[PDB]
């Protein structure tokens, strides 16, 4: 089960929560473990690659400028 935090960004409360996020992660993590074996036989590795690439073209185009936004911002403060 995920935690419905108010602040979207890694706020003080969100950071502290991180610990609990690991427990809820393992819950469904097991399915992934067996799935590892699943995707072994199937050659979806190459498909999902380009698959996520196409979607990320528009999606990542926002988080790219956004992510680098605060990064560049730290350039002035640090340097």
From Swiss-Prot:
Residues 44-52 are annotated as: Lipid binding. It comes from the Eukaryota. Residues 56-79 are annotated as: Lipoprotein lipase cofactor. Residues 1-16 are annotated as: O-glycosylated at one site. This is Proapolipoprotein C-II. It comes from Homo sapiens (Human). The chain holds residues 23 to 101 of 101 of the full protein.
């Amino acid at each position: 089960t995920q935690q419905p935090q108010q602040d979207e960004m890694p706020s003080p409360t969100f950071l502290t929560q991180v610990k609990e996020s690991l427990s809820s992660y393992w819950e469904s993590a097991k399915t992934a473990a067996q799935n590892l074996y699943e995707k072994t036989y199937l050659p979806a590795v190459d498909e999902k690659l380009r698959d996520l690439y196409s979607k990320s073209t528009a999606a990542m185009s926002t988080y790219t400028g956004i992510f680098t936004d605060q990064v560049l911002s730290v350039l002035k403060g640090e340097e």
